[PDB]
C-alpha cells in the first residue's frame, strides 16, 4: 500500500483492480495482503536465513 493514496500496487494491485485472476508467484503470505485478497495454503516454506 501507498501510505496516503490508499491504492495497492504490484501483483496484489493487479488482483484487486481486476487486471489478473491468479498470482502464481513468490508472494509472501502477510496479514495486510490477506485482508484484501485470498491466499492459498502456502506452496513453499521459507524464513530469514
Amino acid at each position: 500500500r501507498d501510505a496516503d493514496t490508499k491504492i495497492w500496487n504490484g501483483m496484489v494491485g493487479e488482483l484487486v483492480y481486476g487486471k489478473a485472476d491468479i498470482a502464481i508467484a513468490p508472494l509472501t503470505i502477510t496479514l495486510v495482503r490477506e485482508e484484501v485478497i485470498d491466499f492459498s495454503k502456502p506452496f513453499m516454506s521459507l524464513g530469514i536465513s
Partner: peptide, 10 residues
C-alpha cells in the same frame, strides 16, 4: 483464458 500474474525472479 485466465490471466496469471507473476514476476521475473529466478
Amino acid at each position: 483464458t485466465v490471466v496469471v500474474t507473476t514476476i521475473l525472479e529466478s
